[PDB]
Amino acid sequence: QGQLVQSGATTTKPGSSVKISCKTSGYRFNFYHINWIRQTAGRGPEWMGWISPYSGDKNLAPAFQDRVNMTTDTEVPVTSFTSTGAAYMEIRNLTSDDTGTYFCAKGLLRDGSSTWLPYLWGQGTLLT
Amino acid sequence: ENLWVTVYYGVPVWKDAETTLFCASDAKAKHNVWATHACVPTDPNPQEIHLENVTEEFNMWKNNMVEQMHTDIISLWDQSLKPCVKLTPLCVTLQCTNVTNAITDDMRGELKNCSFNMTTELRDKKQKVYSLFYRLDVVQINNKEYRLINCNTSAITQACPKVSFEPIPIHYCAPAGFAILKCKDKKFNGTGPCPSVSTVQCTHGIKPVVSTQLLLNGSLAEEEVMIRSENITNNAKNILVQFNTPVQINCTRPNNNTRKSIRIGPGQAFYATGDIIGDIRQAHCNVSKATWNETLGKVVKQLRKHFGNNTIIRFANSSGGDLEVTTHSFNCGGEFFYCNTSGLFNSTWISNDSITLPCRIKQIINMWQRIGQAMYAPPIQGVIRCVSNITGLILTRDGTETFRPGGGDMRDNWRSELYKYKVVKIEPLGVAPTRCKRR
Amino acid sequence: IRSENITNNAKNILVQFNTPVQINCTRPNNNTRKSIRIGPGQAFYATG
Amino acid sequence: NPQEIHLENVTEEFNMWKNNMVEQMHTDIISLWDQSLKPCVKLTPLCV
Amino acid sequence: AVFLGFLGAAGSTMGAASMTLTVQARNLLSGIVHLLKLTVWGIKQLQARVLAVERYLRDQQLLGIWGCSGKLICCTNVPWNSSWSNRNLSEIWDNMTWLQWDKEISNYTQIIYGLLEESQNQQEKNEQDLLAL
Amino acid sequence: AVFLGFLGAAGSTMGAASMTLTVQARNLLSGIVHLLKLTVWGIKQLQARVLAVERYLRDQQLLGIWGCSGKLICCTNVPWNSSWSNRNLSEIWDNMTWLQWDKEISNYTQIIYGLLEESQNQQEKNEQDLLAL
Amino acid sequence: AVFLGFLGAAGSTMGAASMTLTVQARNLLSGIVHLLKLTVWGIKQLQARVLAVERYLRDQQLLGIWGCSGKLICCTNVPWNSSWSNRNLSEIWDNMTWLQWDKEISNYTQIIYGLLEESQNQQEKNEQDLLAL
Ligand SMILES: *[C@@H]1O[C@H](CO)[C@@H](O[C@@H]2O[C@H](CO)[C@@H](O[C@@H]3O[C@H](CO[C@H]4O[C@H](CO[C@H]5O[C@H](CO)[C@@H](O)[C@H](O)[C@@H]5O[C@H]5O[C@H](CO)[C@@H](O)[C@H](O)[C@@H]5O)[C@@H](O)[C@H](O[C@H]5O[C@H](CO)[C@@H](O)[C@H](O)[C@@H]5O)[C@@H]4O)[C@@H](O)[C@H](O[C@H]4O[C@H](CO)[C@@H](O)[C@H](O)[C@@H]4O[C@H]4O[C@H](CO)[C@@H](O)[C@H](O)[C@@H]4O[C@H]4O[C@H](CO)[C@@H](O)[C@H](O)[C@@H]4O)[C@@H]3O)[C@H](O)[C@H]2NC(C)=O)[C@H](O)[C@H]1NC(C)=O
Ligand SMILES: *[C@@H]1O[C@H](CO)[C@@H](O[C@@H]2O[C@H](CO)[C@@H](O[C@@H]3O[C@H](CO[C@H]4O[C@H](CO)[C@@H](O)[C@H](O[C@H]5O[C@H](CO)[C@@H](O)[C@H](O)[C@@H]5O)[C@@H]4O)[C@@H](O)[C@H](O[C@H]4O[C@H](CO)[C@@H](O)[C@H](O)[C@@H]4O)[C@@H]3O)[C@H](O)[C@H]2NC(C)=O)[C@H](O)[C@H]1NC(C)=O
Ligand SMILES: *[C@@H]1O[C@H](CO)[C@@H](O[C@@H]2O[C@H](CO)[C@@H](O[C@@H]3O[C@H](CO[C@H]4O[C@H](CO)[C@@H](O)[C@H](O[C@H]5O[C@H](CO)[C@@H](O)[C@H](O)[C@@H]5O)[C@@H]4O)[C@@H](O)[C@H](O[C@H]4O[C@H](CO)[C@@H](O)[C@H](O)[C@@H]4O)[C@@H]3O)[C@H](O)[C@H]2NC(C)=O)[C@H](O)[C@H]1NC(C)=O
Ligand SMILES: *[C@@H]1O[C@H](CO)[C@@H](O[C@@H]2O[C@H](CO)[C@@H](O[C@@H]3O[C@H](CO[C@H]4O[C@H](CO)[C@@H](O)[C@H](O[C@H]5O[C@H](CO)[C@@H](O)[C@H](O)[C@@H]5O)[C@@H]4O)[C@@H](O)[C@H](O[C@H]4O[C@H](CO)[C@@H](O)[C@H](O)[C@@H]4O)[C@@H]3O)[C@H](O)[C@H]2NC(C)=O)[C@H](O)[C@H]1NC(C)=O
Ligand SMILES: *[C@@H]1O[C@H](CO)[C@@H](O[C@@H]2O[C@H](CO)[C@@H](O[C@@H]3O[C@H](CO)[C@@H](O)[C@H](O)[C@@H]3O)[C@H](O)[C@H]2NC(C)=O)[C@H](O)[C@H]1NC(C)=O
Ligand SMILES: *[C@@H]1O[C@H](CO)[C@@H](O[C@@H]2O[C@H](CO)[C@@H](O[C@@H]3O[C@H](CO)[C@@H](O)[C@H](O)[C@@H]3O)[C@H](O)[C@H]2NC(C)=O)[C@H](O)[C@H]1NC(C)=O
Ligand SMILES: O=C(C(=O)N1CCN(C(=O)c2ccccc2)CC1)c1c[nH]c2c(F)ccc(Br)c12
Ligand SMILES: *[C@@H]1O[C@H](CO)[C@@H](O[C@@H]2O[C@H](CO)[C@@H](O)[C@H](O)[C@H]2NC(C)=O)[C@H](O)[C@H]1NC(C)=O
Ligand SMILES: *[C@@H]1O[C@H](CO)[C@@H](O[C@@H]2O[C@H](CO)[C@@H](O)[C@H](O)[C@H]2NC(C)=O)[C@H](O)[C@H]1NC(C)=O
Ligand SMILES: *[C@@H]1O[C@H](CO)[C@@H](O[C@@H]2O[C@H](CO)[C@@H](O)[C@H](O)[C@H]2NC(C)=O)[C@H](O)[C@H]1NC(C)=O
Ligand SMILES: *[C@@H]1O[C@H](CO)[C@@H](O)[C@H](O)[C@H]1NC(C)=O
Ligand SMILES: *[C@@H]1O[C@H](CO)[C@@H](O)[C@H](O)[C@H]1NC(C)=O
Ligand SMILES: *[C@@H]1O[C@H](CO)[C@@H](O)[C@H](O)[C@H]1NC(C)=O
Ligand SMILES: *[C@@H]1O[C@H](CO)[C@@H](O)[C@H](O)[C@H]1NC(C)=O
Ligand SMILES: *[C@@H]1O[C@H](CO)[C@@H](O)[C@H](O)[C@H]1NC(C)=O
Ligand SMILES: *[C@@H]1O[C@H](CO)[C@@H](O)[C@H](O)[C@H]1NC(C)=O
Ligand SMILES: *[C@@H]1O[C@H](CO)[C@@H](O)[C@H](O)[C@H]1NC(C)=O
Ligand SMILES: *[C@@H]1O[C@H](CO)[C@@H](O)[C@H](O)[C@H]1NC(C)=O
Predict the structure, then answer these.
(1) Ligand 7 near B210 CB (within 6 A)
(2) Tell me, what DSSP letter sits at residue B171?
(3) What is the DSSP string of chain C?
(4) CA angle, E26 as apex, G103 and E60 as ends, to 5°?
(5) How far apart are CA B254 and CA B257, in angstroms?
């Protein structure tokens, strides 16, 4: 299974800094990365970066190197294999050119060559 | 695509199960009633393996270890009482007076000077001997004639005085191919999925201390003060609170007693209470009024998390029952104290020196399970004074809240120590597909 | 009919039916059990 | 046929004063006497 | 290196745990479980001893009637019926743990144990028919 | 197919029974034989448990010192001395049952068990002398 | 021939004793050790029975996690670290006895038992990677 409910689709104006939430269920939140993907209207879809709900190790594209704060809090065990978690997304020197739909997607596998690959996506959120 | 069955021997998978758990103990050598000499020596390196990423389900209220310890302890007492002196000749008419009157009115009947006829080593010749008996061990006849408290219900045996009642740490261990799982969650409820998990060959040292209301010499929480019950919303399920700070309690029987051996037969010897050297004083326990008020407030704070930040909870004394359950009853230096506890649970709390406990002493204590068996604790010589920590409680709700103590079930004591453990069984066989084929 | 030496009269004969012949038994007296304390915890149950 | 195998060239250290067999026989014999006396007649009425 | 210990990779992937099988293999019979006194702790320990050797040989017996005597990883000729689990390899050996894998394969575990049993009775019958020349 | 059950082919020919060996192999240690109470039924069951594992390993030990560890049908290098039984193959494997066969071969069963024992001690000595290069 | 008996070559050279291993192999589980009465001799015998099967399987377990299941003489891939013993072959197998050899190699016996254990966990992982084609 797996679900990743995202935050609201509210809008602000340039210069600000917004927070996007992603709430997970039905899967062990710590066993897969959490990716942030952006589908702007005036650019091809961009991979922003992934983060580890277990190791805390984050990795973003150099286009977002010093402009994004990715944070996740610890999970809440529901069963032996089910937990609930959350992931957060931020932008610093923000303008109105960063407009589009934002998604959160968890990793594919736990090991191998396609560990972090965005496999399970959220419903997306509309921006400014 | 081309996938065949591939067999694996030694896969990290386990299932819950019940099994016989053997005991371990550290080297200390007389012999205690818990027979910890008959256990395997504990490793000086108690190996604890952390189970990364693992999350297990625990349920201390369906745990089988507590049901096995509650039966092992009882089997340890029956085994240790078997070869000792049967005291059936003591069930005879007693002529009793008060010992050394003129002190504090109705506290001179608290212990009696009793003389009686008794069998000797010769079956035809009797002896008139006298002994001291506590008031809680005798009843009247209706003149100054008394009898032992147990003679109409149970048979009596006196514990062999070479056996020590001092609890010794016991380690429970799972056999080869089984496992013990520890829940390293510092704020664990006792049930539910536990995130941090480790496996151990044996549990930690557990002293088999059987106390009432106040849990003594126990293990402490690391954060806050946890509260554990299966249905907290049910008032008939006992509340097992556990402190993180130990509130110290000092107890003493100040009377300097004398043990006088009496030959009730060939090789049979009854140990009577001779007389009292020095003052006839009152047995009692102290506990710092400061630490008790502080630690009693910590329980209130965590009790609010189940009844509301606005509600008011009150502490009241016991509401009746048998003597063992109405008082802080326990064992201290070989004598069985029964401490009135009203000075500890007489407090109401708003929405936002030391105290002393008068204890009486019993010698003829009855078994808590069946009826028809009771033990005579031989009188201890000298002055008794024991020092221990109160590390938990056993509370009761009534349905402004009110909480009172109690808990005559021995397994509630073992629950307070076996809550973080769980017995599983290893199943090292595992089959899974891969593109490997024999020949 | 089963015996080891049927021709020997000192070896019991164990016959076994194929039909069950029913037998009803009864002690019709309505008895009373009266407990008697013969010692500490010892109780003898007499016929009242 | 009490099989006895000779150990050629072998030389062992013995110590009958630390031997464990004597400590086990001394306890077995005592356990044999206690086991055999258990069901017999207690003579406490003779102490008269 | 790593050496997670006994059951250390219980939360790891099936492929990672499949490299530390000797860790759990050696701890199936030793532990700490010299006279046999029949006390409350003695009858206890005696049971803990006999139970361990019983469950150990039941596994080694099944390992024998499959041709896997003394193996940690043996391969068979019984092919994987997809109705057992249609999951792919890369989503099993780099994804699932042995605990949850046993949870979903538990139904067909008795079916698989029979297919391997006769495949070994027929393989040793073929090996005899081949060495008859 | 057939599946005569445990000991089902006890009256069948030796060749037919030689195809249902796993049936009797798996029923040598399981059965129905959790605390150890020392009652009249408890001491009874405890003996039934220890006896079963003893006789199981005695067979597996002999199967080991012959090089047949984990085999239902292993072949050896010990040739058949005709003084054991001069019967032909087609009058044994398509004729006799395993019960009557054990009745007539019972005399030389201790002789055969020695020939296989040293043939395995010499085969593993030859295998070491061959891998020494 | 010779047949020195059980432990007969205890004073012989290691190479000579290495030819009479079945003699000590068969006497590890039989001996003389039918109801289970709990008397002073009965509890005694019951312990002597369970202890024998325990120590037998502990050896066979180590023999298994080294790939030597059912072998009297198996060879490994763990090379001889000279710090264990710098003695030459001809001054060991034609000179020393197994008793004194165990006396001087006793220190490193736990080190060697680990090297063989992972060499078998890696050999069976390589055998699976080779039959994957
Ligand atoms: C758990 O909690 C429990 C509850 O808290 C706790 O129980 C406590 O137990 C202990 C021990 O078991 C108890 O301690 C005892 O205390 C007794 C009383 O001590 C107090 O009172 C005396 C006397 O007071 C009069 O005199 C003084 C001046 O001296 C005046 O100022 C007073 O106002 C008063 O005089 C007026 O009032 C009288 C009536 O009220 C009138 O009659 C009189 O005319 C006046 O109007 C004080 O002297 C004491 O001071 C001493 O203690 C203070 C701290 O309080 C210290 O600064 C200092 O050390 C002082 O010396 C105190 O205030 C004691 O009697 C008793 O000790 C004696 O008895 C025991 C056994 O009975 C003996 O073994 C011991 O040796 C003592 O004997 C001496 O004293 C007697 C009495 O005179 C002599 O007859 C005797 O010969 C001997 O004299 C020798 O020693 C003298 C000094 O010691 C010395 O002067 C002599 O020269 C000679 O050498 C004992 O200590 C305590 O009371 C319990 N608690 C309570 C609440 O009751 C328990 O421990 C806790 N822990 C557990 C269970 O583990
Ligand atoms: C418990 O459960 C968790 C979660 O499932 C497990 O954590 C996961 O482990 C797997 C296996 O190791 C991880 O997969 C690997 O991912 C790495 C990518 O990480 C690399 O990139 C980082 C950012 O670029 C880099 O900083 C890292 O470098 C160091 O820094 C971090 C800082 O925290 C440090 O912690 C690291 O250890 C590094 O030292 C890091 O290098 C990827 O490189 C791996 O691929 C290699 O390995 C595979 C085989 O394993 C091989 O096929 C490839 O070709 C390549 O050679 C591999 O994919 C995964 O990322 C972890 N996290 C998840 C899934 O969220 C944990 O292992 C479990 N523990 C137990 C005991 O069960
Ligand atoms: C108990 O003991 C009895 C007696 O020993 C066993 O019975 C014997 O079993 C063997 C093995 O199966 C039999 O040998 C076979 O004989 C057949 C010949 O029978 C065929 O011919 C009949 C008449 O022509 C025909 O009607 C049959 O067809 C069906 O009809 C009968 C009606 O009752 C039915 O019962 C049958 O089952 C048939 O369905 C029958 O086909 C012969 O064909 C066999 O040869 C084939 O198989 C061998 C290998 O087995 C192979 O080498 C050949 O090349 C060929 O392929 C085979 O010789 C024997 O006839 C039986 N009777 C005896 C000996 O009196 C019984 O099996 C034992 N049971 C157990 C559980 O131990
Ligand atoms: C206990 O411990 C002792 C002492 O260590 C062991 O005795 C030694 O045994 C070894 C192995 O057998 C001996 O090595 C052999 O030596 C012979 C040389 O002896 C020959 O020469 C004699 C004089 O020339 C000759 O008389 C002998 O012939 C017979 O006469 C004697 C009379 O007593 C009789 O006892 C003999 O048995 C003979 O029947 C004798 O032939 C040598 O020939 C051997 O070499 C052959 O074998 C080796 C392999 O073993 C092979 O590699 C060679 O190529 C060649 O084929 C072999 O070297 C040693 O001499 C003995 N004495 C010592 C060391 O002092 C005894 O065996 C131990 N017993 C147990 C049970 O452990
Ligand atoms: C409990 O009651 C018994 C009564 O049966 C008390 O025993 C008796 O105590 C008196 C007084 O101590 C003894 O008398 C004394 O005898 C000595 C010896 O000659 C004499 O020197 C004294 O002056 C005094 O008269 C008496 O012997 C004794 N009887 C027996 C049978 O021992 C006992 O003291 C009481 N115990 C307590 C703790 O109250
Ligand atoms: C809680 O644990 C403490 C510590 O383990 C217990 O204190 C111990 O109490 C016993 C008897 O009460 C003491 O033994 C006594 O020692 C004195 C001094 O040698 C001796 O005179 C007595 O005859 C007896 O042997 C023991 O020393 C003491 N240990 C410590 C460290 O203080 C306490 O009793 C326990 N409480 C409960 C309720 O179990
Ligand atoms: O195991 C027990 C048992 O009943 N108990 C409860 C009492 N106990 C205490 O420490 C205690 C705690 C508070 C007040 C008084 C005593 C030890 C264990 C017995 C098993 N056979 C027994 C017997 F044949 C006679 C008497 C007893 Br008492 C037992
Ligand atoms: C309790 O009473 C006993 C005597 O009934 C006391 O024992 C005496 O102790 C002193 C120590 O100074 C010895 O010199 C005596 O020989 C002892 N007498 C006997 C009869 O043994 C004991 O000291 C008393 N205990 C207390 C705490 O007062
Ligand atoms: C209980 O008694 C113990 C000792 O009998 C007390 O602990 C002592 O406290 C004093 C403080 O003045 C220290 O100087 C001592 O070193 C302590 N003794 C030991 C052995 O640690 C304790 O305070 C008493 N508690 C109560 C509640 O009465
Ligand atoms: C045997 O006698 C007892 C009394 O000794 C009878 O018990 C009574 O049964 C009736 C049932 O109608 C009750 O109402 C009474 O209360 C019982 N009396 C007592 C003292 O228990 C019993 O019925 C008699 N049995 C027969 C078969 O007559
Ligand atoms: C003991 O003393 C109390 C109070 O003085 C009194 O009521 C009681 O009757 C006395 N008992 C005896 C046996 O003297
Ligand atoms: C002992 O028995 C006698 C009867 O001879 C009786 O007079 C006396 O009161 C009895 N003693 C006690 C203490 O009961
Ligand atoms: C105990 O805590 C767990 C934590 O998840 C909770 O689910 C459960 O309801 C709690 N039970 C009680 C009786 O407090
Ligand atoms: C307990 O103590 C209080 C006051 O100290 C007293 O009122 C109450 O009666 C006592 N209870 C018992 C059972 O002695
Ligand atoms: C029992 O029946 C068998 C049937 O063959 C017969 O041989 C035997 O003699 C009989 N014995 C008796 C005692 O009837
Ligand atoms: C899978 O198993 C089912 C029965 O469980 C069987 O009917 C089917 O033919 C099998 N298919 C394959 C491909 O093995
Ligand atoms: C058969 O065995 C006998 C002894 O039982 C032996 O003398 C004979 O040489 C052997 N013959 C063959 C051909 O093995
Ligand atoms: C021998 O073992 C030691 C440690 O015991 C190790 O440091 C050394 O490298 C080893 N040498 C060889 C040749 O194996």
Answers:
(1) yes
(2) E
(3) -B-S-TTSTTS--B---SSPPP------S---EEEEE-SSS-EEEEE-
(4) 115
(5) 9
Chain-centroid distance of CA A16 in Å reads 19
Sort G131 into a burial class: Cβ within 10 Å, 0-12 / 13-18 / 19+. Answer: middle
Instruction: Give bridge partners of residue A120 from the DSSP assignment.
Output: A106
Contact B265 D45 (CB under 8 A): no
Q: Which residues pair with B158 in a beta bridge?
A: B376
Q: In DSSP terms, which residues pair with A126 in a beta bridge?
A: A101
What is the end-to-end Cα distance of chain B in Å, rounded?
19
- Could you give the CA distance from residue B100 to residue B321 in angstroms, rounded to a whole number? 32
* Residue minimizing CA distance to atom 23 of ligand 8: B382
Q: For B71-88, b where at least 16 C-beta lie within 10 A, e where not — what string?
A: ebbbebbeebbeebbebb
Ligand 6 atom closest to Cα of residue B330:
38
- Select from B400, B394, B402 the least CA-distant residue to B346: B402
The C-alpha angle with vertex E87 and arms to E86 and E88, in degrees rounded to 5, equals 120
Show residues of chain D in contact with G32, CB under 8 Å. Answer: none
Distances (CA, A) of G11 to G26, G96, G98: 20, 9, 8
User: How would DSSP label each residue in B93-125?
Assistant: -EEEEESS--SSSTTSTTEEEEEEEEE-SSTT-
d(CA B201, CA B181): 9
How far apart are the CA of B254 and the centre of ligand 8, in A? 14
Selecting from F62, F65, F128 the residue whose C-beta is nearest the C-beta of G75 gives: F128
DSSP structure string for B187-245: T--SEEEESSEEEESB---B-----SSEEES----SSS--EE-S-TTSTTS-EEEEEEE
Residue A84: its chain B contacts at CB < 8 A? none
Instruction: Locate the domains of chain G by residue range.
Output: 1-133
State in Å: Cα C42 to ligand 10 middle: 27
Positive or negative torsion for Cα B366, B369, B371, B373: negative
Shortest distance between the Cα of D35 and any Cα of chain B, in A, equals 15
Chains touching G by CB (3 or more pairs below 8 Å): B, D, E, F
Does B18 reach chain F within 8 Å, measured CB to CB? yes
Which letter does DSSP use for residue B29 in this model? -
Method by which this entry was solved: X-ray
Please tell me the CATH code under which domain A1-128 is placed: 2.60.40.10
Which of B95, B364, B129 is CA-nearest to residue B269? B129
* Domain locations along chain A: 1-128
